[PDB]
Design a protein around this nucleic acid. Sequence first.
DNA 1: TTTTTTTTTTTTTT
Lengths: 97, 400, 394, 222
Amino acid sequence: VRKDPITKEWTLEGGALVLADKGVCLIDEFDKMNDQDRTSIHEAMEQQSISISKAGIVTTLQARCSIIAAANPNGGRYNSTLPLAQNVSLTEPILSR
Amino acid sequence: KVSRQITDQDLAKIREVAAREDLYSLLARSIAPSIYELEDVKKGILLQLFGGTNKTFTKGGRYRGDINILLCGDPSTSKSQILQYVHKITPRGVYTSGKGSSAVGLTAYITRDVDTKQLVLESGALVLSDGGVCCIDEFDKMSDSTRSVLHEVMEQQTISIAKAGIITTLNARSSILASANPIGSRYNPNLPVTENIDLPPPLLSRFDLVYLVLDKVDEKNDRELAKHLTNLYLEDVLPVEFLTMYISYAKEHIHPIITEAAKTELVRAYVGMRKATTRQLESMIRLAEAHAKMKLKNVVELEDVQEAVRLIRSAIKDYATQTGKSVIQRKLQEDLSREIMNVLKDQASDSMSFNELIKQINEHSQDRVESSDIQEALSRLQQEDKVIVLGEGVRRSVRL
Amino acid sequence: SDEINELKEMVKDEHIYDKLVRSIAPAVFGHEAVKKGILLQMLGGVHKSTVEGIKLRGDINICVVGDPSTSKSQFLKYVVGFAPRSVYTSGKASSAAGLTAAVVRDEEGGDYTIEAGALMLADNGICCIDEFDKMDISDQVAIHEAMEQQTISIAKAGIHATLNARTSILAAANPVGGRYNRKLSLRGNLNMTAPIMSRFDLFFVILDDCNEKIDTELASHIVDLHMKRDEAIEPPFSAEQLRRYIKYARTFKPILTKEARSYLVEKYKELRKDDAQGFSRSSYRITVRQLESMIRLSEAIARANCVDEITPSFIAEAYDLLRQSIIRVDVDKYVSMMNMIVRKIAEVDREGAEELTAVDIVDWYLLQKENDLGSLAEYWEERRLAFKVIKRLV
Amino acid sequence: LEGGALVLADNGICCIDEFDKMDESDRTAIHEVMEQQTISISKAGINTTLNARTSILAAANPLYGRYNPRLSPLDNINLPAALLSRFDILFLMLDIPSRDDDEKLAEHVTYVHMHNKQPDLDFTPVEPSKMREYIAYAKTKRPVMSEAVNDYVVQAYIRLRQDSKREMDSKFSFGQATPRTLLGIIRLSQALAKLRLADMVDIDDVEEALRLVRVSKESLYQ
DNA sequence: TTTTTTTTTTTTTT
């Protein structure tokens, strides 16, 4: 949510998901995602919406996006001869999602 | 009006000063009137303003005359005085400190015009230095984004700005001298030199020289220095502003050439230097062609590179006394991977506590180092994929 | 104009293949094969088709490595000092974005001003960096978007975007030991990930060492470079005529549809039959992409020889040419048993006798077996089988 | 354009507290002002270096919450190591409880609010006007060192250049009794002479600075 | 018949 030029209150910019409603959002390389922007991923697949933080306006949205996750294995080629839970860096809460 | 075209008759007064034998020493002692001894510094810095010559080829080239020089030693050497001096003599001067330098700091701040409300490209402290000489304090202490403008102009000898509205990659070429201190600030007796110079020897590979000041407690030094500072107080040939006009004439109007003669010496010495690198020899001409830009010689003397090589040896005589010792972290890693192996054999798990590891390291022998550097060697295994952390309480061993 | 009549004269010779080689960077001495790729980099690939669906590569890529003092950087200024639209920065500080967009906020006044940044005019060009150690890991794969998609979208929570990046990225890191590290599989040699690593093909290692003759030859030719004079030693090709030859060689769209690409299969098959073991070897795999790479080599080989449709010889060049720098990386119960029965000797009977006792071959094996097996049961058939095949061959 | 501080009153003392909280904004500039005789400005369109002839003094407030006696010198201080050889001399002020002096202290704190005038038995305060005129009478004097005292400034300074060095590792430190402490010691007798008038610079006129030399340091013990 | 306006709050960012 960004305040527009000169005198205007804050306009709300949709997360690209809003652009993707009824459609599908595509991601690759989860090793490269910060733990910051990744939080809200876990949101959409639960409510089918987004609820952010900034700032001055109570809202809700609608996110119908399907999600394609592509991510390279921890390190190189095949990682867990041990359980694949040993493979992913990402937390299981966002995984089983 | 204020708070230079050369006259003709003092030009042959220049050549008169050229037939004078000690101009190599003389002008140097005229460089830094304030400072006692350290004559190799006045020597070098003399050759610094006479530094190099332009090679434009057909294309590419542009190795210039540009010479960086580091100097350091016992803390506060009166290095900052020679910096604050030479800084002022220069057509375009530059000076700052360590920690007072960074990547973002010296190039193209591209600020708004403010009062006319228009963003206009600004030259950073490096663009203005283009030509002439930069100076800074304590390269051991420079930040991490510091050296990021250095890695940029040392060789590229340019700067790249594409951001905002306008795109220019514009050139910066100037010789430079940064003052510094050993980590001690005494670098301590004996010891390997590289770590003692701080920094890795790979980063030091580039810098054209290493100047090490030290403290002899000669008596006989500090009283002889005192007797220097004993003056003023109250109230030897030393030209003042005659050297400057000679700095103007001796640079463009001379176009020195190595001839054939250069090679027989400049080459053969380099084998024993090597027995050095192609970066030292890179300037083995540059420093000697700075002895070429001296004397008004358009064809340079075969015997200069003796004391040019000697100016290189000066850094090398500082090496007479870590990453430059060969194996090091690697021999430690043979015994690391062997300790991890033999634990993997003895212990039923691929993992062992880093503690049990260091108990198996630092104590057994003394080529077995301290915990954090064992952890830098296992970092060097980790960055090799040759270890696995398995929680921050223990250490796993690499697996199929 | 009339300078193609220069080019006909140049496209006659057999020898202009080796000529184009010794004619590229005089500022560099030796190093040979790596030179080729540089040219072959300026030279374009297919970078097109086959529908429907994604555009295949295309392009080519090189990260040249070796001990500092290598004088590899002399290649890089040669990129920018020769090639068209060359973008070059070695720095850690771009920053991040960088080749990525910032995105600049506040502009001010509504903001979201999208920086290029960096690689913009770099598009359709040869991009260069130094010292991957000094770009760290954060941005490693974020500049790798263009190394697969060939285009890079850029996200700060700015406005949704994607950018045309299509470019070769050539560079040189200094090895993380500063040297070889012979033993280092180039995978752990780099301190970087296979997705961005396997993608740049191929690296082409050069270690720079002293040798007494060579110390005098570096004291010969490198000296002649040190020389202001004689700098009069010349390449067989005038640089600018090499450039106009490229601007001519950039017109070609050479394609091997030729059925002798069947040979490229066997070759590529036998490309991975060797890397098959170890998987800690040159592998990689080597990557399915290295077949595409195998192709994108002869793409430029064709612009080199100016004829199209390529040949078995042409790809043979490139295949072996990979093969060195993949070799620069070099230094079902009983299927695990006949694996290591001939494998223990594979790593050891060449480097030693392959002797002593039968069961010692078991004991270093209880080391590496336990870590990739998936149970206590899969541990025991790594025990009693290392017993059972011993009394099988005893 | 308004230069503050180092510009505002020049050829006069600058008085600082919270000197470690000056950030780096003041730090590098004053880091120049120990080379004195300048302040450079490249900001905006103005490239001048304007005179800061300012004298420097600071009250150094060490990091929280007090300096620790076991700790090596410079540990308490958060300033750069290069900036403390730039001052001539420094006095460390430790507040150590003494069941004696804290008595007269607390009686000194209780002399307020009982009275207004604190001192007695006895001193008569010396007022600024009349004092300032001798202090401005002195700067005109301009002493010139005799050579005897000069050579003496060399000799004991050799063992001063030895005991800070022969103590080697920092521990107490700092060495080296660098040139600036001799520079200083000399300028301090040049300062001390005008307190005598003279211009002849007595041997003990040097020695009085010599008493302050170590007294500055070595307070790091208690 | 027209007049005249840059801090403070929050934000996303290396």
